[PDB]
Structures are given as C-alpha cells and as structure tokens.
DNA sequence: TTTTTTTTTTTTGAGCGACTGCACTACAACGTTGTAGTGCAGTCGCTCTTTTTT
C-alpha cells in the first residue's frame, strides 16, 4: 500500500481508500470534492471541472450524508473566502491555493457551488437508486409514481403462512410428523430463514432437484432405512467379533433393542444403539460384514427433510412477495437495489448505465465496508474500466461489523482483489499517541491479526497538535490501556458479568468523586477539564448487559443514559396509564375507569387519598365534573390542550420533576402526548384515537419516529452506548467490562475464499460450522477493532477466563475463542496462568494491568446548588380584537315541485340551474336531461322541470310587469361577490333600532345576537340586473318545505321573510348595490336608479297566480344613508 | 410523589367467607387493589389475530388440556372431543392437529394415570368454622374419605401449593383426617399429610391476620420469588433455615431469576400491580418480601412431602 | 314489534451437556474377592446480540 496525498490522487480508473480510524475521513472526502470542483492536480487531475450536480457521493446513513453536506457546504464557503482574499489559516487550504494559478475564476466556481450546494447529488445507497429508477424509468421499467413500505415483516409472514398453506397442509400423517420435528409452525421457519429472504438470496449448496418433492424424499429415506432394516434381519444371529474390555457383554441386549425396533417404517429416529454398530467405532473399542459398513453409511449422513423445506421457502416465499408488491405497487429498500440490478442485468440497461456515465461521470463512494454484493454489481456494472469516469472506494475493512444488516468483507475482499491501486492514511487524529501506540501494540502481535490475507494491519501515526494528551489521576499520570484481569481459574458467564460491571461502576464512581475535586484532570499540554459524568463511556453489545451496567451503575447513586436505546415508547408503563386516562375522559360515567385512572403512577396519589376519595361522593363529583369538562376540552380543542390542562390543573409535572427519575417518565408523556396529536388530526372520530393507542400499545414495532428519546441534556450521564451505535463517534475515557465475552455461531452460513459468493450449507458439516465460525471471528475482531478506537485519554479493558464449555477443570480456557485472547495469546490455547503471562508480557508505559477488586466504600456525593428565583412575563392586555371576515350566515299529480325533495344540495342544484342557463334563448328539454344526468336525479322529473322553468321565466317580477327574458346578456350580472368594510365595532342594540325605525317587517322578530365585528363583509349577490335605465336585485331561495297548497301569499311570505332574518341580507344588498353604483357610475342618485329587491321563491311560482312566488320590496331611502355612515365612520 | 403504602382503618367483619380467603392468597396485592380500595387495572382485550393458529401455547392450550384432562378422569372418548375441538376450529388442519391432539392426550393419560390411581368418589361438603371469633361459610367440592383430591395441568408453583394449604386447612379444622394431595404435570406434586385440629386452627388463625394485615397495609408476600427463596433458604432435613453466605446468594439468584425471567418466560415482576407499588427493586423492599415470605411461606414448605 | 342482564382468573422452556450414584462385567491379587472401566438413570447449570435505508 501506499500513503494517501488529497492533492495529489491520480482521479483516474478505480482507487481504493482505506481510511483508519478516527482518520479524517470526512475531511479527505470534503478535500478531493475541492479537488473535482476546481479541477486540481496537474497531471493528475481531472481533465474537465464538474459542477455541483455531476459529483456523486454516495453514504448509507442519512443523518452522515447530511453532515457530509454541511461540511462540504462549510468548506466551500472558506475555500471561497481563502480565494478571495488570497490567504488562509490551513496548511492544506494553503496548498490548495497555492496549486491553482487562475482566482478570479474559481472564486466565480466556488461562488456557483455555494448557490448550487442545494441542488447537491450527496444522497443515500437507496435514494440514489430511486432517483436513478424514477430518472429514467423506461430502461429499467418503474413505475412513476410507488409507495414505500418501511416494514416488511407482515407480508413475508403472509407469504410464509401461504406456503405453509400450500406445502404442509395435504401432507399424510408420516411426513407430517418429520415436519412438526423440524419445525412446530410457519413461525419456527420464518424465524430461522428470515437472515436469508432479506436482502440478496444466497446460493444453497448441492441443492435438491426441482421435480424432488416432501413425499418422494420421505420414501427415498423410507427405503434407505428399509435396506438396512433387511440387512439387520438377515444378518441377525450371530457374533465373530473379539470381546474387548471397553466393549461390555450387554451389547446382546442392545441388539434385543435392534430387535424389537424393525416393526414398522413410520418412524423417522433410528435408535441409538446402531451407534454401537459402527466398524469404525467397533474397532477403537474385526468388523468384517458389511452390515455394520451399511449402517455408518447411514449415519454417514443426518436423514432430515429440513434442506428440502428451506430450499422451497426460499424459492415460494421471495416470489410470493415480489408478486404481492407488483400487485398492490409497493416497492421496499432492498427492492430498489435489486430493480436497479435486474436493469443493469439486461441487455438495453448497459445503455442506461452510460446515461448514469451521463448524469455523474465520477463517484466517491463513502462506507465501502457496509456494501452489498448488489451494490457492488451496479458499482462495477457502472463504472468498471471506461475512460474519464473515476471511482473513489473510500472504506475501512477493520470497521465492517454490520454483517447481521447485510454487508459482507468478501465483496469487499472481491473489489480489493478488482482494483489495482490502494493508498492509505497514516495520521490519527483523534486520539492521544499513548492510545495509539496500545492499538498498534495489541494488534501486532502476530502477522495478519484479522485472520484474512486481503485485511492487513498497519502502524497508524498520532497527530502532532495532539501528542500532550494526558489523563492524570491523583497519584500520577494514569496509563492509555489498563485491562483489569479478573482474578480466578474459571469463571461462568452471570458471576463474570456481574463483578466486571461491580469493578466498572467503582472506577466510574472513583472517576467521578475524585474528579469533582480537582484531582482527575484531562489535560491537553497545560490546558486542564475536569472530568463529568459525560466524558466517561460504557461500551456494551447487549440490551441484557447494557441493563446490568446500568443496574449495577445506579446501585452507587450514579444516574446513565442508554444511547442505543431502540425501545418503543408504546411498550412501557406510562402509554398504558394514558390509555386508562384517555378511556377515563371519553367515558367518565362508569367510576370503574375512572378509579383505575386516577391511581395511576401519573396521577401519584396515596391509598389513603383514593380512600378518602371513594369515601367522599362531593370530592368524587368534582373529580367526574373536572373530567367531563376535558372531556368538553378534548372534543372542542384537541388532545394537546387536554393533557396541557390536565398536567397544569393536576399539576403533576411539577410533582414528577420533583420525584427522582421521573423525569425520563415526564419526557416519556410527552412524546406519548405528541405522537397521539400526530395521529389526531389525521383521524375524525374520538374513541378511534383511543383504538389507535390500543393497538400501538398492543403493535411493539419499533418505528423512527416512535422510539425513546434522551431524557436530560444538561445533566451530565454516563453514555452506554452499543459497539455499533459507537461507528465514527468520540469519547474521552471507554470502559469495555465485556469484551472477552463471545458467542459461537451455530448455523453454516459461509463466503467461499474463492468465488467469494454467499454459501448456505443445510446440512450440519463440520467444514461449513469451521468457515462459519471464522468469519463470525473475524466479526469480533473487527469489533474489538471499532470499540478500542473510539477512547480519546484512556480506555480500561476487563479481561477474565472465560469458559464457554460446560467443564469447570479441563485445564484450558476458551479465551483463544474469543476476539481478546486470539491477540493477547497469539491464537493459541493456555490457561489461566498463561492468559496472565500473556498479559503481563505485554507491559509497556502506556499498556499496564491491575487485578479485578470487589468492593464498595460510598455510592457518591450529590453537591447540590440553590436555584435562583425566575418568574414568566404576562400579557398585559387582549391579544386582537374582534377582527373577522365573515358573511350573512355568519352574523345568523306525482310529478310536482312540491313534491321536490327539500335539502341544502337540490336548493344548490336548483341555484346552479338558475344561474347556468341564459334567459333570452328558450329551454331545451334534452339540456335539462344532461343538467339531470350530471346531477343526478331522476329522468323522470324532465319534461315537468322544464315546462316548471318555463313558467318560471314566463311569469314577470316587477311593478310594471318585466319578465327575465327581456334582459340581455350585458345587462345581467349573476352571482356578485362584494367585500364590504367597516371600522366601528357593530353593536346590535344600535344597529336593530335603525331597521326597527324605518323597516316595517321588523314589528315581530326579537332581535338577533352577535359579536361587535369590525373588519370586512362577504357577500354573494345571486343576479343583479337593469332595465330601462332602473338598477334591480335579484336572489333566490328554494327550500320551502312547509308548503304544498297555494298558500303562499304575500302574508305568509313576509312570515316567512321575518323567520328566516332575510331582511338584515336584503339590506346589505341594497346597501352594497348602493355603494357600487356611486362608485362606479359617476351623478348617481339613490331613488333615481335603484328600483328594489325581487326575492324569487321558486316552489311558490305558479302560471295562474303571478304575484305568489315574488316578493318585491323598496327600502325607505333614509336607511341606506344612515348605514352607509355607520358602516364608514 | 409520596409512597403509595398508607396504613389504612380496617375493621374484620364477622363473617368472612371462604372465596374472598382463596381470592387474597392467589395474590394479595391485587386483593389490596381491588377490593380493598376496588381499584382493578382493566387491561384491553387481545385483536383478533390474522392467521389461523398453527400452534397451542398460552390460554387455548390450557384450556384444551383442562378439558382434556377433565375427560380423561372420567376414562371418556378422546377421539369424540378430538372431533369437538376439531370442529370448532381450535386445533391445527390435518395432520398437525392430530399429532397436537395426541402429545397432548400422552400427556394428560400420563397424568390420569397418577390421578385415577388413587381416587374415590367423594361429594361436596359445608365448611362452618369459627376462628378468632371470625365466622367462614363455604363449600369444599369432591371431598373423598382419603382426604383432598385436586388436579391441574399446570407446573410446580407456590400459588397452587398455597390454595391447596389453605384448602386444607379449612378441610382439617373440622373433621378430616386426612392427606391432601395436588398433582401437576412433570411428575409434581403438592401433598400435606393430616395435622390435629389445634395446628390447623393455629394456622388458620394466622392466615387471618395475614387477611385483615394485607386490608390494612399492601401485604408484600410475593409467592413465586418468596417461595424460591424459601426453598433455597430451607433445609427440610433439620427443620432449620441455613443462614450461610452461599444460601443467602443462591436465593439471591433464585429471586432474581424469579422476580424477573428471561426472554423466553415472564417474569413475576412484570405485572400491573407490582409496577405501582415500586419501579425498581429496591433490596429494603427485597428484604420486606424476605421477611413477609418467611413468616407466611413457611407452613408450605414445612409441611410438604 | 315490544324488550333483559353480567363482573371471576387461569398459562407459559427445553435441549445440550456435565456431576454423581448405582449396577455390571473383566481381570489381576489373594476358588474367591478387590479394583477398574463402562452404561443407565436422577439431578442440575445455561441460555436465547447488534440496525437503518424515501
């Protein structure tokens, strides 16, 4: 390998970054995206500047693309303001002036990049892959428009229940009993193939062959142990074979359990005494019949349908959901990553990849260690070895442990063998060179520490600025590593468990008292911190031993965080007690719900105040009357204005910030109060949100939205954090009480070291259990790896023989099989004796060791302060007055039209029936069909419709008689919209005395009552028309119930006028239509041009009477004047 | 927020039936809840799940044992209840409910043949006791003349132990001489041999005040976890509690393991009426257990045989 | 086409592997008996990760 220049990297063909830990990997990225911006390098370089759009990056997390693009954004901007003014402050930033000639140019290019850094091509694995989809979706064949699914466990559930459906169901009783020995349920087997129907599906090994069923498999098997069966009943009856010592005289007997074991074939499980049958056996205990030959042939091989049911799964169960999500449409994460792989597969989507080599000609791939084999198909089916297109692998093989998600390091194995290029970076610049000398000490004790060949190991250099780090104590400068060994020949795993996490919590607690006196001190040449409850971090890689740290941990009065804390917030205690108060307000009457509510531990009364509650009916009514007013709140104003009333009037946050550790539970409410206002407003009814509540409760699927937050952020707490959730983070003192801790693999789930493929072995081999169980040690290596480079000033390590076999004394330990043994023993076995020796071998400056003391003095001390006095500022008058822009409704024989159905959408239709036809042209019965066709009423109601609107429009409304037909198409105007304003505040009292003075329909009609509204009017005249010089107002209702007959005079309209308060609508007419004809036609005059208002009841208009149906009235002539003063002011 | 434990007024009325006896010592913190103060947490019913059940665990499964186990007392067709439960659905289609129907009915006839192998026929008889001028009416069903005889298909646990010890404390104290015995599956069994009728008052006498204290004040007897503990701590051999610092960390472990299980079993911890009580495990509150199980407990594991 | 009621929970781990006790024959020390090796059965520890993508 070589070191890594940013200024100085050849842009060409594929290069492989190997960037170590705590290496400026997001700094070097930032640099060579500079680089292919400006176009900088010489001969080197590129040979064209790229904009913006044309540079891809390509980061899994998207909380890391984010902050990639902040601080490319960051040194974009420095870059342009370090070329403006022709200087810096960073060496590299120097350099980087220093290489360019032109600055007016690239100032103008840095200055296009800043406003183009919105439109940035920073994106995701998937979203790349969906833009890609979405971009050209004809080569590839996508859909334009697709609903993502974030899970997919319920439909590959589905899907393994309908293969359980179609498989095991019409099976007989003896293969049925195979099935239920391998697997109980769908459930078993979803369970242990669903590492394999996610992401890519892996190649079985000697799989069976397609037209192979249960049932031909079954008598394959069948007739296998029948053959043996014959050849035990033929042979039977004799014994040549020498008596040993090891070999008893009861094997006869055993062989009485041969005979009464050949009855029948039903059964699957040979017994165990054929065992005693083997020649290979029976001569380490002569062998000369092939019978025993016959039945180590047998027991060669495990006799198990298991393989065949597994490889029907894997090839039912995939198409089942493929074919369900082309149904419905969806499409899934994984499932973007192989649509783009099935379009790179065929033969036009090569094509489709030089119009990728059209949109991005360069790709700076970021995280190389977290890549699927998909991923690195399209990446070498893209941007293999065609010119002027560059590939930048920037990854790290010592920090891949996400091989449970779905990567993999033999496809990164693959790619390095691909490449021919490698350059590495030699500086760390996180942590202290006492740090990095104990990583480079650990992990060159023998050569190839990673056990692969394509994964070695280099000295990495400490930083210059950083090299005066030192974490002193109060005796002396305290060592970088000091690996606590516990003391003892073998130890289980609870007892291991449990004194690491006693020993770490008394270093925490020792920490932390001497560190609040002055004494543990972080100091950076002469610069001293000391050290709080924040800087010292637990490194776990279990929930159950993340809970014993943090059990173990605040037994000595020290509060802790759990970073990787991904429990949902519906599963604990606190969504149960809101779900009792939510049925407690929708349904306050049963005292059963109520009474189960208020003893909650949110409400936090005594038994004694619960008594005394059910004792006292006066104290229980206002508790019923207080909850039936939020319930008046909860449907009037949402849940949030509730639970706010409900925790101010209650008071009980003050009372949980009070109580210690109820301050998590009060976060816990409140994300609990968020997330049911979210899921509020998207529903109408109100007990469908308590449903909603009880089904999340009862659903414990883990969303991004619905997991638990952190609780404090000013208060300091010790951070456990899993190994995982610790990638590319820092911390200034790491304790690692688990790290001899290890787990065997069980399944044979293996890379080939040739191919490089995904190897599945359904069958327990003992080759395929050995490369198993090395990669899955190359794991823990890899995250001994991740967790040892993320301590800045010390790292304390906890160090034990630990012992995964059930002996107590076998003379050896099993730390060899862990990832800390295999670099403290050099891959070898010892003891106990020799794990110290190995230990205490090792024994450097910076490298040291002590023994595991058990033993407490004192938990801590809380050196508490005074709180000083604050207050909250309080409004001093009304917010706004009342401002509205309101309208008139705010401020309020078998065929016949009295046989109209009476309604709000037949008035409306009727309305719109008005206003769409044109009165001068005659009505066309086939237009009133189409008007009832796009309606939607009866056919039959036509020919009466029409014949009713032409007597409508035949009869004249006017005091000289003036018909709707003689008004042309310039002189009407249908549905005018005014705005009408006023200043004052509209008072009842002096506004209804006004009407009441001139307005004689106003003698009855107790006067309505509103608010005073100042502000602006909405109004909707529905025609307004003139005729011979005469202005006139028009509008229409049309809901008549009430009336059949021809009752419908002038009185009962003027009733009907003064029931409904259509006389303050009239009025503002007249005055809106007075205040428009002054402002629009110049010498106007109220009484001269005005002629009234026609109100047209269209139920009440018949041939024979021609004054039913219209109501025309003209106002006084004083009103209008006196209103259009008050209204203006 | 001050502690929910107040010592409350409570009188011992007169006659206090033998129900509300076997309803506080199934479990006395939910008896304190929900009589005493009449607090009970009414949890939602379960959704209908969306697949028909292709296994028996949980409450299905032992409501097909007890019906089978019921059926198999009487030496009845299993092959017509077979039939039953198949018709109505509750077992797997095919083959699988079949294999279900006959691991469950191996089971339940290897328990019958324990249980029929000393059965008579016994009738109900009236229980009228007078106890620390406490009257307690009930009935106790199928009292045969070797003594009590009850079955269950469930495991060895210290609530059924104690439901049956009260049961026979209630049969001794009037009349009864006789053993009572309880069988549950894997070859357990509860027995209590016959005891005179001033140790059985005496006892009675003591569950009592165990019933008018957990009124009063929340009766911390756990009996899982404290009978785990108990059996750790006992030594039947003497009739003496070890006080040792090897048995007092093993039971420990036992209450630990106990209070809280493991990810496959539920623990006795996690339960809606320890949670308001107490949200950790606080050893002063382990201890008040420790004692609380100690002086209550103890009968059970010294009488068991 | 009218109308009645009712408050009781229950259950849930088992296969893999070792420790120890009893039986059972093989074989050498002193025909018979003590010691050693192996098989079967009752009893008991242990243990079942990690996570994020529009």
Redesign the interface.
């Known amino acids: 390998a070589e070191t890594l220049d940013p200024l100085r990297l050849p842009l060409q063909g594929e290069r492989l970054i190997e960037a170590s830990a705590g290496t400026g990997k997001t700094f070097t990225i930032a640099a060579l995206y500079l680089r292919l911006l400006l176009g900088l390098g010489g001969s080197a370089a590129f040979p064209r500047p790229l904009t913006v759009e044309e540079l891809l990056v390509v980061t899994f997390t998207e909380a890391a693309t984010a902050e990639l693009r902040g601080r490319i954004r960051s040194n974009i901007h420095e870059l342009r303001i370090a070329c403006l003014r022709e200087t810096t402050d960073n060496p590299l930033y120097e350099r980087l002036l220093e290489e360019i000639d032109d600055k007016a140019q690239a100032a103008q290019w840095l200055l296009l990049a800043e406003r183009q850094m919105d439109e940035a091509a920073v994106f995701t694995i998937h979203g790349f892959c969906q833009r890609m989809l979405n971009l050209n979706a004809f080569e590839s064949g996508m859909l334009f428009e697709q609903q993502l699914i974030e899970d997919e466990s319920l439909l590959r559930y ?1 899907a393994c ?1 309908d293969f ?1 459906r179609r498989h ?6 003896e293969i ?2 195979v ?2 020995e391998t697997w ?4 078993a087997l979803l369970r242990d193939i669903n590492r394999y129907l996610q992401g890519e599906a892996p190649v079985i090994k000697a799989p069976p062959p397609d037209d192979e069923t249960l049932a031909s498999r079954h008598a394959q098997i069948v007739a296998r142990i029948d053959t043996v069966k014959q050849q035990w009943r033929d042979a039977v009856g004799e014994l040549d074979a020498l008596i040993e010592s090891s070999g008893i005289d009861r094997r006869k007997f055993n062989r009485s359990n041969q005979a009464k074991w050949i009855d029948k074939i039903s059964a699957w499980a040979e017994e165990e005494t054929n065992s005693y049958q083997l020649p290979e056996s029976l001569e380490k205990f002569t062998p000369r019949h092939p019978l025993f030959e016959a039945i180590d042939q047998l027991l060669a091989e495990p006799l198990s349908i298991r393989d065949l049911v597994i490889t029907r799964a894997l090839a039912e169960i995939r198409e089942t959901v493929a074919r369900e999500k082309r149904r419905r449409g969806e499409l899934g994460f994984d499932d973007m990553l192989s649509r783009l792989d099935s379009a790179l597969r065929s033969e036009s989507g090569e094509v489709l990849a030089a119009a990728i080599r059209t949109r991005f000609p360069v790709a700076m791939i970021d995280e190389f260690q977290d890549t699927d084999p998909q991923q690195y198909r399209i990446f070498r089916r893209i941007w293999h070895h065609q010119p002027e297109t560059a590939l930048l692998l920037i990854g790290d093989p010592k920090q891949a442990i996400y091989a449970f998600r779905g990567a993999d390091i033999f496809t990164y194995m693959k790619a390095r063998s691909e490449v021919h290029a490698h350059y590495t970076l030699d500086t760390n610049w996180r942590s202290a060179p006492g740090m990095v000398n104990s990583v480079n000490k650990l992990f060159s004790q023998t050569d190839d520490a990673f056990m692969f060949r394509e994964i070695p190991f280099i000295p990495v250099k400490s930083a210059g600025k950083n090299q005066a780090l030192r974490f002193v104590f109060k005796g002396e400068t305290q060592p970088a590593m000091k690996m606590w060994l516990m003391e003892g020949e073998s130890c289980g795993v609870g007892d291991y468990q449990s004194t690491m996490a006693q020993v770490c919590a008394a270093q925490i607690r020792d920490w932390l008292q001497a560190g609040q006196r002055g004494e543990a001190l972080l100091m950076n040449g002469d610069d001293a911190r000391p050290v709080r409850a924040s800087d010292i971090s637990v490194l776990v890689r279990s929930r ?1 031993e993340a809970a014993q740290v943090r059990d173990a941990l ?1 037994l000595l009065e020290i509060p802790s965080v759990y970073l990787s804390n991904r429990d949902s917030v519906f599963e604990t ?1 606190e969504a ?1 007690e809101m ?2 108060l939510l049925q407690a307000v929708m349904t306050p009457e049963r005292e ?2 109520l ?2 509510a208020l ?3 949110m409400m ?1 009364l ?3 105040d ?2 005394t509650l ?1 004792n006292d009916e006066h104290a229980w009514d206002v508790v019923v009357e207080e909850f039936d007013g939020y319930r008046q709140i909860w449907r009037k104003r949402g849940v949030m204005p509730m639970l706010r009333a409900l925790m101010s009037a209650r008071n009980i946050a003050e ?2 910030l ?2 210690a ?2 301050e998590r539970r009060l976060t816990d409410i409140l994300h609990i109060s968020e997330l049911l206002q979210e899921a509020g407003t998207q529903l109408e009814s109100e007990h469908a949100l308590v449903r909603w509540l ?2 999340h ?2 659903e414990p699927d883990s969303n991004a939205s619905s997991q638990q937050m952190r609780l404090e952020s000013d208060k300091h707490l010790v951070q456990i954090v899993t190994i995982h959730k610790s990638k590319g983070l820092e911390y200034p003192l790491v304790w690692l009480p688990f790290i001899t801790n290890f787990r065997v693999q069980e399944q044979a789930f293996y890379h080939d070291r040739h191919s490089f493929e995904a190897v599945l072995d359904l069958n327990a081999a003992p080759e395929s259990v050995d490369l198993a169980e090395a990669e899955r040690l190359a794991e823990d290596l890899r995250l001994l790896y991740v967790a040892l480079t993320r301590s800045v000033w010390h790292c304390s390590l906890g160090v034990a023989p630990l012992v995964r076999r059930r002996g107590d004394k076998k003379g050896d330990t099993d730390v060899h099989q862990s990832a800390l043994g295999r670099l403290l023993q050099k891959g070898e076995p010892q003891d106990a004796a020799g794990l110290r020796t190995c230990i205490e071998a090792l024994c450097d400056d910076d490298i040291a060791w002590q023994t595991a003391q058990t033993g407490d003095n004192q938990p801590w001390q809380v050196n508490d302060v005074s709180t000083a006095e604050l207050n909250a500022k309080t409004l001093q008058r009304l917010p706004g007055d009342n401002w509205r822009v309101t309208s008139y409704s705010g401020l309020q024989p078998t065929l016949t039209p009295h046989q109209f159905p009476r309604g709000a959408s037949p008035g409306t239709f009727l309305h719109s029936l008005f206003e769409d036809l044109d009165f001068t042209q005659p009505v066309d019965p086939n237009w009133v069909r189409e008007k009832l066709e796009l309606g939607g009423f009866e056919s039959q109601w036509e020919p009466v419709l029409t014949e009713w609107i032409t007597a409508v429009l035949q009869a004249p409304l006017n005091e000289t008689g003036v018909s709707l037909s003689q008004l042309s198409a310039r002189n009407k105007q249908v549905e005018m919209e005014f705005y009408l304003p006023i200043s004052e505040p509209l008072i009842a009292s002096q506004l209804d005395t006004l009407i009441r003075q001139f307005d004689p329909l106003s003698a009855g009609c107790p006067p309505l009552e509103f608010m005073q509204v100042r502000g602006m009017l909405k109004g909707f005249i529905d025609l307004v028309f003139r005729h011979e010089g005469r202005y006139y107002l028009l509008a229409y209702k049309s809901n008549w119930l009430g009336e059949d007959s021809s009752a419908y005079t002038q009185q009962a309209m003027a009733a009907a006028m003064q029931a409904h308060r259509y006389d303050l609508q009239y009025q503002l007419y007249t005055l809106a239509l007075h205040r428009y004809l002054r402002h629009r036609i110049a010498d106007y005059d109220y009484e001269h041009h005005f002629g009234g208002v026609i109100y047209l009841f269209l139920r009440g208009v018949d041939k024979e009477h021609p004054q039913q149906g219209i109501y025309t009235t003209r106002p006084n002539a004083g009103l209008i004047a006196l209103m259009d003063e008050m209204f203006a002011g | ?6 010592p ?1 007024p409570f009188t011992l009325p007169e006659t206090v039936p033998l129900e509300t006896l076997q309803r506080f010592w199934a479990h006395p913190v939910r008896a304190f ?1 929900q009589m ?9 019913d ?2 209908i799940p ?2 028909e059940p ?2 028996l665990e949980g409450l299905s499964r032992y409501q097909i044992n007890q019906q089978l186990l019921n059926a198999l007392v009487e030496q009845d067709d299993a092959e017509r209840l077979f039939r039953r439960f198949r018709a109505a659905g509750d077992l ?5 409910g ?2 279900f129907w006959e691991t469950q009915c191996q089971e339940m006839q290897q328990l019958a043949d324990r249980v029929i192998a000393c059965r008579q026929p016994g009738q109900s008889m009236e229980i009228d006791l007078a106890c620390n001028g406490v009257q307690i009416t009930g009935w106790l069903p199928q009292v045969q003349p070797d003594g009590l005889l009850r079955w269950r298909p469930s495991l060895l646990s210290v609530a059924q132990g104690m439901q049956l010890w009260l049961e026979h404390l209630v049969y001794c104290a009037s009349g009864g001489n006789g053993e009572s015995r309880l069988f549950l599956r894997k070859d357990g069994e509860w027995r209590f041999p016959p005891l005179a009728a001033e140790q059985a008052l005496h006892y009675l006498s003591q569950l009592i005040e165990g019933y008018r204290e957990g009124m009063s004040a ?1 009766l911390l007897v756990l009996p899982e976890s404290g009978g785990a503990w108990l059996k750790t701590c006992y030594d039947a051999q003497n009739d003496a509690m070890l006080d040792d610092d090897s048995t007092l960390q093993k039971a420990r472990t036992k209450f630990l393991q106990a209070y809280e299980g493991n ?1 496959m079993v539920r623990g006795e911890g996690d339960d ?1 009426w320890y ?2 009580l107490w ?2 495990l606080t050893p002063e509150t382990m201890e008040a257990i420790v004692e609380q199980s100690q002086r209550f407990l103890l009968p059970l594991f010294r009488f068991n045989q």
Not at chain 1, 184 to 187: E, Y
Not at chain 2, 1 to 6: A, G, K
Not at chain 2, 92 to 96: R, V
Request: glycine share 6%.
């Open positions: 589905q229940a359980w095991c169901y019409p099976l007989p009783r049925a009993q099935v239920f109980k349920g769908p459930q159950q605040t205690l149960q779900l009792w059963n719900t009474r189960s003893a909650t531990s936090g005594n038994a004694l619960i008594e059910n009372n949980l009070a109580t550790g109820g009880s089904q409760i009862l | 927020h001050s502690e929910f434990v107040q409350l809840f005493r103060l009449q607090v009970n947490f009414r949890t939602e379960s959704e969306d697949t292709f296994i797997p289609y095919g083959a699988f079949e294999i929340p990810m809606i949670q308001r949200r950790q």
